[PDB]
Amino acid sequence: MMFLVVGQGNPGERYARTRHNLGFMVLDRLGLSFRPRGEALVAEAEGGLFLKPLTYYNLTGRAVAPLARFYKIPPERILVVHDEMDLPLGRIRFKAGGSAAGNRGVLSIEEALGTRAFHRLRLGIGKPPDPSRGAEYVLSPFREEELPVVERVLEAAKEAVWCWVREG
């Protein structure tokens, strides 16, 4: 296996529209065929793997590390796609190593792998007006007025993902 693309999210229909499931939403735009493999939905394409862990958001390392270890996927070929409160909706940024900047899904993968040196695709979702409501904000759906931006973010993310996988 050449690489591993991980979409951050939570399992179950009740989380499917929430901001914290934006990484699953990107993965779901890729055209792939996901199959259940333990606490994970996994797809194989282009010589590599795509993973929607069903571990819960903060526990995704539990699915990522056994897969990476087993197929000897190096951290340079692991990409973690996730929602990011520190960037405004509409903004997308790649990140190579460095701190799991308080993203607990990225943190759980660092913990389980024993390294910070994997890549992340950060998808800005903005912040809530009050910091203490962060969990609430990410476990809410987007506002209907955000949907046009969200769509275009998903389109841009889908291209970024394939670019990272493929040509660049």
mmCIF file of C-alpha atoms in Angstrom:
data_model
loop_
_atom_site.group_PDB
_atom_site.id
_atom_site.type_symbol
_atom_site.label_atom_id
_atom_site.label_comp_id
_atom_site.label_asym_id
_atom_site.label_seq_id
_atom_site.Cartn_x
_atom_site.Cartn_y
_atom_site.Cartn_z
ATOM 1 C CA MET A 1 0.000 0.000 0.000
ATOM 2 C CA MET A 2 1.395 3.315 -1.182
ATOM 3 C CA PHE A 3 -0.393 5.707 1.181
ATOM 4 C CA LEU A 4 -3.208 6.218 3.677
ATOM 5 C CA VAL A 5 -5.743 9.008 3.554
ATOM 6 C CA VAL A 6 -7.736 9.353 6.791
ATOM 7 C CA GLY A 7 -10.942 11.356 7.023
ATOM 8 C CA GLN A 8 -11.686 12.559 10.588
ATOM 9 C CA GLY A 9 -15.250 12.090 11.889
ATOM 10 C CA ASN A 10 -17.586 10.254 14.214
ATOM 11 C CA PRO A 11 -19.599 7.147 13.427
ATOM 12 C CA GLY A 12 -23.312 7.014 13.164
ATOM 13 C CA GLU A 13 -26.091 8.862 11.389
ATOM 14 C CA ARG A 14 -26.415 11.375 14.191
ATOM 15 C CA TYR A 15 -22.931 12.822 13.420
ATOM 16 C CA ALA A 16 -23.129 12.573 9.621
ATOM 17 C CA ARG A 17 -23.979 16.241 9.014
ATOM 18 C CA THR A 18 -21.855 17.806 11.798
ATOM 19 C CA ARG A 19 -18.894 20.071 11.180
ATOM 20 C CA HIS A 20 -16.605 17.571 12.880
ATOM 21 C CA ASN A 21 -17.469 15.081 10.050
ATOM 22 C CA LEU A 22 -16.110 17.265 7.245
ATOM 23 C CA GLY A 23 -13.180 14.822 6.760
ATOM 24 C CA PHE A 24 -15.678 11.966 6.201
ATOM 25 C CA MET A 25 -17.586 14.263 3.758
ATOM 26 C CA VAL A 26 -14.376 14.789 1.698
ATOM 27 C CA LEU A 27 -13.689 11.052 1.636
ATOM 28 C CA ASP A 28 -17.238 10.437 0.516
ATOM 29 C CA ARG A 29 -16.716 12.701 -2.548
ATOM 30 C CA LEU A 30 -13.852 10.538 -3.892
ATOM 31 C CA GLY A 31 -15.827 7.922 -5.766
ATOM 32 C CA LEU A 32 -14.624 5.008 -3.603
ATOM 33 C CA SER A 33 -16.060 1.725 -2.334
ATOM 34 C CA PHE A 34 -15.755 1.559 1.433
ATOM 35 C CA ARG A 35 -15.997 -1.770 3.251
ATOM 36 C CA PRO A 36 -16.217 -2.449 7.006
ATOM 37 C CA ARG A 37 -12.986 -3.650 8.526
ATOM 38 C CA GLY A 38 -13.313 -3.685 12.373
ATOM 39 C CA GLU A 39 -13.896 -0.126 13.726
ATOM 40 C CA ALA A 40 -13.261 1.382 10.233
ATOM 41 C CA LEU A 41 -14.675 1.870 6.748
ATOM 42 C CA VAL A 42 -11.809 1.248 4.324
ATOM 43 C CA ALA A 43 -11.444 1.724 0.551
ATOM 44 C CA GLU A 44 -8.553 0.755 -1.728
ATOM 45 C CA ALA A 45 -7.761 2.887 -4.836
ATOM 46 C CA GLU A 46 -4.680 3.835 -6.790
ATOM 47 C CA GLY A 47 -2.487 1.443 -4.868
ATOM 48 C CA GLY A 48 -3.365 2.911 -1.483
ATOM 49 C CA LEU A 49 -5.961 3.169 1.241
ATOM 50 C CA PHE A 50 -8.739 5.517 2.317
ATOM 51 C CA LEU A 51 -10.070 5.234 5.918
ATOM 52 C CA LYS A 52 -13.142 6.577 7.743
ATOM 53 C CA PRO A 53 -12.380 5.263 11.227
ATOM 54 C CA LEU A 54 -15.529 4.296 13.274
ATOM 55 C CA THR A 55 -13.496 4.664 16.539
ATOM 56 C CA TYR A 56 -14.861 8.092 17.390
ATOM 57 C CA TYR A 57 -13.035 11.342 16.518
ATOM 58 C CA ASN A 58 -10.514 11.350 19.328
ATOM 59 C CA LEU A 59 -9.674 7.734 19.114
ATOM 60 C CA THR A 60 -8.878 7.448 15.346
ATOM 61 C CA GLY A 61 -5.265 6.443 16.080
ATOM 62 C CA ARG A 62 -6.636 3.143 17.250
ATOM 63 C CA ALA A 63 -7.608 2.371 13.565
ATOM 64 C CA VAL A 64 -4.843 4.290 11.797
ATOM 65 C CA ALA A 65 -1.777 2.809 13.551
ATOM 66 C CA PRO A 66 -2.535 -0.912 13.068
ATOM 67 C CA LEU A 67 -3.089 -0.218 9.345
ATOM 68 C CA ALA A 68 -0.001 1.928 8.848
ATOM 69 C CA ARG A 69 2.161 -0.504 10.842
ATOM 70 C CA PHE A 70 0.905 -3.532 9.069
ATOM 71 C CA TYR A 71 1.387 -2.232 5.461
ATOM 72 C CA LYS A 72 4.482 -0.268 6.406
ATOM 73 C CA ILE A 73 2.987 3.034 5.263
ATOM 74 C CA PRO A 74 5.423 5.688 6.260
ATOM 75 C CA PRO A 75 4.211 8.837 8.006
ATOM 76 C CA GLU A 76 5.167 10.937 4.980
ATOM 77 C CA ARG A 77 2.446 9.076 3.069
ATOM 78 C CA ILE A 78 -0.244 9.487 5.711
ATOM 79 C CA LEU A 79 -2.686 12.351 5.217
ATOM 80 C CA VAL A 80 -5.266 13.302 7.909
ATOM 81 C CA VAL A 81 -8.123 15.418 6.498
ATOM 82 C CA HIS A 82 -9.971 17.297 9.286
ATOM 83 C CA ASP A 83 -12.024 20.243 10.217
ATOM 84 C CA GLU A 84 -10.088 23.136 11.735
ATOM 85 C CA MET A 85 -11.634 25.829 13.955
ATOM 86 C CA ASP A 86 -8.446 28.014 13.668
ATOM 87 C CA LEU A 87 -9.138 28.765 10.031
ATOM 88 C CA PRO A 88 -12.216 30.467 8.612
ATOM 89 C CA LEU A 89 -14.672 28.495 6.494
ATOM 90 C CA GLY A 90 -13.401 28.597 2.953
ATOM 91 C CA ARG A 91 -9.715 28.345 3.844
ATOM 92 C CA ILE A 92 -7.788 25.070 3.327
ATOM 93 C CA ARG A 93 -4.182 24.485 4.403
ATOM 94 C CA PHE A 94 -1.817 21.551 4.239
ATOM 95 C CA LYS A 95 0.366 20.874 7.266
ATOM 96 C CA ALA A 96 3.481 18.642 7.393
ATOM 97 C CA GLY A 97 4.473 17.528 10.857
ATOM 98 C CA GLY A 98 4.688 19.984 13.769
ATOM 99 C CA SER A 99 2.212 20.064 16.709
ATOM 100 C CA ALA A 100 -1.255 18.356 16.787
ATOM 101 C CA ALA A 101 -2.443 21.914 17.199
ATOM 102 C CA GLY A 102 -5.047 20.908 19.724
ATOM 103 C CA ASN A 103 -6.809 18.677 17.081
ATOM 104 C CA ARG A 104 -7.586 15.624 19.113
ATOM 105 C CA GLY A 105 -8.024 13.349 16.178
ATOM 106 C CA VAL A 106 -4.578 14.367 14.825
ATOM 107 C CA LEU A 107 -3.262 14.046 18.438
ATOM 108 C CA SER A 108 -4.630 10.477 18.779
ATOM 109 C CA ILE A 109 -2.878 9.470 15.514
ATOM 110 C CA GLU A 110 0.397 11.061 16.733
ATOM 111 C CA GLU A 111 0.042 9.102 19.981
ATOM 112 C CA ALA A 112 -0.691 5.819 18.317
ATOM 113 C CA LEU A 113 2.018 6.178 15.665
ATOM 114 C CA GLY A 114 4.679 7.670 17.950
ATOM 115 C CA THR A 115 5.330 10.447 15.461
ATOM 116 C CA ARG A 116 4.255 14.053 14.514
ATOM 117 C CA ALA A 117 5.717 13.656 10.901
ATOM 118 C CA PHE A 118 2.532 12.879 8.949
ATOM 119 C CA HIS A 119 0.570 15.282 6.801
ATOM 120 C CA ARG A 120 -2.725 16.943 7.504
ATOM 121 C CA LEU A 121 -5.253 18.737 5.362
ATOM 122 C CA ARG A 122 -6.819 21.386 7.456
ATOM 123 C CA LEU A 123 -10.321 22.484 6.452
ATOM 124 C CA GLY A 124 -11.357 25.723 8.108
ATOM 125 C CA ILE A 125 -14.736 25.798 9.828
ATOM 126 C CA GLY A 126 -14.389 29.066 11.905
ATOM 127 C CA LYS A 127 -14.781 29.310 15.754
ATOM 128 C CA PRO A 128 -17.915 29.584 17.900
ATOM 129 C CA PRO A 129 -18.552 33.044 19.477
ATOM 130 C CA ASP A 130 -17.596 31.554 22.934
ATOM 131 C CA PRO A 131 -14.538 29.197 23.332
ATOM 132 C CA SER A 132 -16.226 26.953 25.907
ATOM 133 C CA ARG A 133 -18.803 25.974 23.241
ATOM 134 C CA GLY A 134 -16.207 24.457 20.854
ATOM 135 C CA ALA A 135 -17.503 20.903 21.311
ATOM 136 C CA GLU A 136 -21.025 22.101 20.676
ATOM 137 C CA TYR A 137 -20.058 23.979 17.526
ATOM 138 C CA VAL A 138 -18.232 21.010 15.954
ATOM 139 C CA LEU A 139 -21.013 18.631 16.883
ATOM 140 C CA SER A 140 -23.536 20.869 15.139
ATOM 141 C CA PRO A 141 -24.437 20.882 11.462
ATOM 142 C CA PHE A 142 -23.287 23.727 9.294
ATOM 143 C CA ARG A 143 -25.765 26.687 8.956
ATOM 144 C CA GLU A 144 -27.769 26.578 5.804
ATOM 145 C CA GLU A 145 -26.221 29.900 4.841
ATOM 146 C CA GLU A 146 -22.744 28.163 5.034
ATOM 147 C CA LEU A 147 -23.726 25.383 2.607
ATOM 148 C CA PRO A 148 -22.679 27.076 -0.551
ATOM 149 C CA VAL A 149 -19.180 27.689 0.919
ATOM 150 C CA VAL A 150 -19.071 24.165 2.390
ATOM 151 C CA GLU A 151 -19.752 22.713 -1.054
ATOM 152 C CA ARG A 152 -16.945 24.597 -2.657
ATOM 153 C CA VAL A 153 -14.636 23.666 0.219
ATOM 154 C CA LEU A 154 -15.521 19.975 -0.440
ATOM 155 C CA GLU A 155 -14.764 20.389 -4.171
ATOM 156 C CA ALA A 156 -11.371 22.077 -3.406
ATOM 157 C CA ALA A 157 -10.601 19.449 -0.728
ATOM 158 C CA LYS A 158 -11.362 16.594 -3.093
ATOM 159 C CA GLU A 159 -8.813 18.059 -5.637
ATOM 160 C CA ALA A 160 -6.243 18.713 -2.865
ATOM 161 C CA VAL A 161 -6.543 15.193 -1.682
ATOM 162 C CA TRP A 162 -5.983 13.697 -5.134
ATOM 163 C CA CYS A 163 -3.170 16.158 -5.767
ATOM 164 C CA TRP A 164 -1.444 15.025 -2.544
ATOM 165 C CA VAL A 165 -2.031 11.403 -3.441
ATOM 166 C CA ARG A 166 -0.886 11.703 -7.058
ATOM 167 C CA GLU A 167 0.948 14.460 -8.871
ATOM 168 C CA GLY A 168 2.350 16.631 -6.192
#
